[model samples]
Target: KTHVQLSLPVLQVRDVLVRGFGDSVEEVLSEARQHLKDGTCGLVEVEKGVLPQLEQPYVFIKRSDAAPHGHVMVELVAELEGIQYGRSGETLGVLVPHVGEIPVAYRKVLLRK
Candidate 1:
């Protein structure tokens, strides 16, 4: 079992958007633009449930590709709640702690009697 120790809570909403990153950028962009203009763009969102419990943030962006299969990789930008905690070193500790050692001054407790 993998233990996911979240430094902070995260909240995310999913969105489906038309991407424009491939050789077909022009085509996809054109279609997306038309949809936007005509208010025909459909966006479906899946709510994870109540707030506070949610931590990460996310946004959807379009990617385009011209391959036989599809255009670009329209990906969701996973985000964290609160301002980015700190610089590189700062966040590193919050994410990966020393093995068999409890982090100092940390508020969250993994297992308690």
Candidate 2:
């Protein structure tokens, strides 16, 4: 029996804590609402060629409206299969899925401002 090593990008997600003033909440909420109405908040676009090579695709979203502090941000991990690209405040098209799960953390850290 033999095992093959594959050079492929892995999907990852990280939880980020964001704290802001009262005004900040309004701004963030407004932007988030826009993204939701436009159906772009949770969609990630993979390169055209990369789709065919994807392995073990999955998606999950967990959210909370009331936070002890301020806000929570989710960090997405992705890689372009080909040339690099830049964003100029525009949107792209791709096939994606939506899934939900409970939020849990194996490790925890406390930050004080």
Candidate 3:
């Protein structure tokens, strides 16, 4: 096995805390993997007060060379509460199953202000 650099943040911590699930959660997770494959997805801390519900949701931010800041944000089509990823030193990520392990860190710490 070898190592290479990626456009997304690599997780050094093991055992990502999983949270935030919706009937349509796949919609965003797919987007993350897509962006990741296209070199756009990243493990970013959801900005405080920026959300579809007053900055109170768990999601993965997207970046692309095609949009501003590469312009990529996966605001989930969800309505869950007490959700935020990367609450601790654990960097949140979307699990790229069969491809990678960028599972969303945790939804309580990064949701910090």
Candidate 1 regions exceeding 4 Å error are 1-23, 44-113
lDDT of 1 by residue, 1-113 (tens): 12211121111222112212122323333443344334333322233442223222322232221212222223222224443321221111111111132223322211100
lDDT of 3 by residue, 5-108 (tens): 34454332232222222234455445544554565433434345323322223344322112223322223222235444322232234322123555443222
Best by TM-score: 3
Question: Superposing every Cα of model 1 onto the true structure, what RMSD results?
Answer: 20.9
RMSD of each: 20.9, 17.4, 14.2
Q: Show the lowest summed lDDT stretch of 10 residues, model 3.
A: 104-113
Candidate 2 similarity to native, TM-score: 0.22
**Per-candidate local distance difference test:** 0.24, 0.25, 0.34
lDDT of candidate 2 over 6-111, digit per residue (tens)? 1111121222111111133234334433433343333333445544443222121122111222322222122233422222222221212213322232111111
Query: If both were scored by lDDT, which would come out higher, candidate 2 or candidate 3?
Result: 3
Candidate 1 TM-score versus the reference: 0.21
